[PDB]
Design a protein around this nucleic acid. Structure first.
Lengths: 229, 97, 113, 48, 229
RNA sequence: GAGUCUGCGGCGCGCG
C-alpha cells in the first residue's frame, strides 16, 4: 500500500533480556498515544497472569511463627523471601508445581539449590533463602501456582501437608510500566503523537509477551459489545 | 530527570500542559525552557502526576515525597461489637456482655 | 472549576472602541504582548479569539486543549450572548442536570462568581 | 494473626495527622509519576 | 458456554431517538470499566469524522465584527449560528462544499433557504440564521468541510474570498460523552466493575453507530503493533 | 420442648 495505509504505525522494538523492553509506535493521529498507552498500562499491571509461592512446608516446623535451629532467619522471614522467588513455567500442563529443596550444614541456601524440574525454570537463582550454621537441617517443599492479581494466604488456604503454611500470592510478572507521547514530524502537519511504552518484567514472562497478552485482553473485551439487550 | 534525558526521552504533552497551567498560576517564571521550568517546580516540592485512571495529567503540580507513617494499635475497640441477644445484669436487668 | 483567571496588561487594553484595537491586540496576543485574559474592559482578546455557538461546543474545545475551564470566553446560551468561562458554564449544566427543570436551574444559580 | 492493613485501621505521622484508611485502591489507577513509580498513600490537603 | 465465558459482559442498550443512548456492560474484572470507558470517550469526541462550517462570506461585510443593515443579528451572532448548522454529505468526493444562500426583504432566513446541493443534505432546516427587516440584503457563501475534532478558526484560516472570515470547526456529531463505573455484585466476589457510558449525538449519526465506529478505531490501532523494527 | 449463671464499685490510661 502507499498513501494513508502505508503511512502506518511503525512498530519498533528494543528489548534486552526478559526484564526490559521498550516499544515505539508512530505515527498516530491526535491524542492517540495516550488513548492506547494508558489502557494497555492498566492491563499490563492487573491482567497479566503469572506465578507466586502459594504454600511452604518445613519438615520439623508446624506453624508460621517458628524458628529453625542452625538457621538465622525465622520461618516468617523465609516465607517472605519466597514471595520474592520468581519462577517461569513453559506450558498450561504445569498448573501447580512443587519445588523441592533440602540443604544441610554450613551452607547458604540460594534459590538455585532447588532440584530442577523439567518444564519449570528459576530466573531468581541468587535469591537468599537462608543462612545455615552447623547441624542446620532445612528440608522444605514450596508450592508454586499460576494465577492473577493478589490472593491473601487467608483467601486460598492451601494444604498439601497438614502442617504446611500458606503464603500470600503475588501474580503480576510486571513490576512497572511507562509510556511517553512525544511529538513527531510528518512532512505536512506537525501535530502528531508518538507512543513509546517501556515495560519491566520479573523474568517470568517477557515485555513483548506481556504487551501481546495485554492487547489481547483489550480486544477480547471490545468483542463483548456484540449482543444488545 | 537526568536519567530520563539519557534513557532516551524528553517531556510529555502532559508535562507541557501542566506547565502552562502552572505558569498561568505563578509557580514557574514565564519564558524558561520546560527542562529549566520543571526544575524550578521540582524545587517547589511538587512534580507532575498523571491520574492513573485516565492517564491525563493532574492540572497543576502536586507535591510528593517520603513520609514516615505509623499504624496505631488495634484495640478490642476497633474490632467492632454488635449484639443481638445475650446476658443480663443480676440486680439491674440491663444487658451486659 | 468556576474561577476566572487574569494575567498581563502592558500594552493597550481599550478594545471597547477601535476595530484596529481588535486586530492589533489580537495579533499582539498571538505574539507575547497581550494575554488571553487581560484587563480590557469589554473583552480581553481571550473572548475576541473564541466564540462558542452551542453550550457543548465550549467544553469540547476544553478537552481538546484550546481553552482552560477557568478561561474567559464567549458563549451563546438559550437567548443570550453570555461572556462566562467554561467552568461556570459546566457548573450550570451539572445543576441543570441534577434537576431537569433547567430554566428553574439558572433562576436560582449565580454563575457570575 | 497477621493484621494486613485494612480499611478499618488508622495511621498517623509524627506531626499530628491522624486518619483512618477509607479505600485500598488498586495500583492500576492511583496517581502515578512520570516514571511508572506509583504513590502509596494520598493525603487530603485540607487537613493541613 | 457456561462458567467463565458465559459470564460475559451483558451488553445492554437503551436509546431514545438518534441523540441519546445509554450503554451498560457488566460484569468486568478489576478497574476495567475505567480502562474501557475513558479510551472510547477520547475516541467518540475526536475520532468520529464529521461536518462543520469552516468559513463564511457576507457580500458587503469585510470583518467579523460588523453589522448588516436590515438584519437584527450581528455578523458574530450569525457566524455563531452557523456553527450550529449540521450538514450531512454522502461520499468522499465531497471534501469541501460551499453552500450558497441569498434572501432579501421582510423574511426570516432559515437553513432550508440554502440552494440544495446534489450530494449534500441539511438535517438542520429550521435553524435560525437571521431576521431580515426591510431592504434587508443578505448574500453569503458558507464553506463546509469534513474533518475531525475541534479546529480553531485561527489554526486553519480559510480564504476562499479575501474578505471572508473563518469560523471555528466543530467536526464531531457527538456533543458529549459520559461513563460511570458503579460496583456490581456477582455471587462470589463483590469487587466488580460496571461500565455504563452515555453518548449524546447531534442527530447526524446515532449513539450506537458512534460507539461501534469508536471501538473500531481502537481495534484498528491495536493492530498497528504488528511489524517490529 | 434448651436455659443458667456470671460480669460490681472504684481506680489508671488512651480514642473521638
Amino acid at each position: 500500500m502507499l498513501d494513508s495505509k502505508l503511512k502506518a504505525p511503525v512498530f519498533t522494538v528494543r528489548t534486552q533480556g526478559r526484564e526490559y523492553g521498550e516499544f515505539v509506535l508512530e505515527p498516530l493521529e491526535r491524542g492517540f498515544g495516550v488513548t492506547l498507552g494508558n489502557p494497555l498500562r492498566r492491563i499490563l499491571l492487573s491482567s497479566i497472569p503469572g506465578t507466586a509461592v502459594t504454600s511452604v512446608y518445613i519438615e520439623d516446623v508446624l506453624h508460621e511463627f517458628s524458628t529453625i535451629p542452625g538457621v538465622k532467619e525465622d520461618v516468617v522471614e523465609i516465607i517472605l523471601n519466597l514471595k520474592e522467588l520468581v519462577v517461569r513455567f513453559l506450558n498450561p500442563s504445569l498448573q501447580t508445581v512443587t519445588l523441592l529443596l533440602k540443604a544441610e550444614g554450613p551452607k547458604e541456601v540460594k534459590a538455585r539449590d532447588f532440584l530442577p524440574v523439567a518444564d519449570v525454570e528459576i530466573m531468581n537463582p541468587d535469591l537468599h533463602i537462608a543462612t545455615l550454621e552447623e547441624g542446620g537441617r532445612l528440608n522444605m517443599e514450596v508450592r508454586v501456582d499460576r494465577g492473577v492479581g493478589y490472593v491473601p494466604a487467608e483467601k486460598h488456604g492451601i494444604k498439601d501437608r497438614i502442617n504446611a503454611i500458606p503464603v500470600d500470592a503475588v501474580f503480576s510478572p510486571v513490576r512497572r510500566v511507562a509510556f511517553q507521547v512525544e511529538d513527531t514530524r510528518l512532512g505536512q502537519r506537525t501535530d502528531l503523537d508518538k507512543l513509546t511504552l517501556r515495560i519491566w518484567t520479573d523474568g517470568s514472562v517477557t515485555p513483548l509477551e506481556a504487551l501481546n497478552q495485554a492487547v489481547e485482553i483489550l480486544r477480547e473485551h471490545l468483542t463483548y459489545f456484540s449482543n444488545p439487550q | 530527570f537526568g536519567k530520563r534525558k539519557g534513557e532516551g526521552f524528553g517531556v510529555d504533552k502532559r508535562e507541557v500542559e501542566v506547565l502552562r497551567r502552572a505558569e498561568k498560576l505563578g509557580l514557574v517564571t514565564p519564558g524558561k525552557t520546560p527542562e529549566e521550568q520543571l526544575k524550578e517546580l521540582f524545587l517547589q516540592g511538587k512534580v507532575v502526576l498523571y491520574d492513573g485512571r485516565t492517564g491525563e495529567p493532574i492540572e497543576g503540580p502536586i507535591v510528593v515525597g517520603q513520609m514516615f507513617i505509623m499504624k496505631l494499635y488495634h484495640m478490642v475497640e476497633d474490632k467492632m461489637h454488635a449484639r443481638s441477644t445475650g446476658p443480663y445484669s443480676l440486680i439491674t436487668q440491663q444487658p451486659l456482655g | 472549576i468556576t474561577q476566572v483567571r487574569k494575567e498581563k496588561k502592558g500594552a493597550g487594553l481599550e478594545f471597547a472602541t477601535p476595530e484596529e484595537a481588535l486586530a492589533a491586540h489580537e495579533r499582539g496576543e498571538v505574539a507575547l504582548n497581550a494575554p488571553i485574559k487581560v484587563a480590557g474592559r469589554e473583552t480581553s482578546v481571550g473572548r475576541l479569539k473564541y466564540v462558542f455557538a452551542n453550550p457543548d461546543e465550549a467544553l469540547l474545545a476544553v478537552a481538546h486543549g484550546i481553552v482552560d475551564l477557568q478561561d474567559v470566553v464567549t458563549v451563546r446560551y438559550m437567548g443570550k450572548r453570555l461572556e462566562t468561562s467554561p467552568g461556570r458554564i459546566l457548573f450550570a449544566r451539572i445543576v441543570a442536570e441534577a434537576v431537569e427543570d433547567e430554566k428553574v436551574a439558572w433562576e436560582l444559580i449565580q454563575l457570575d462568581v | 494473626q497477621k493484621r494486613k492493613l485494612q480499611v478499618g485501621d488508622k495511621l498517623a505521622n509524627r506531626h499530628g495527622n491522624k486518619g483512618v484508611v477509607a479505600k485500598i485502591l488498586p495500583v492500576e489507577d492511583m496517581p502515578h509519576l512520570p516514571d511508572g513509580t506509583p504513590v502509596d498513600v494520598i493525603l487530603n490537603p485540607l487537613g493541613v
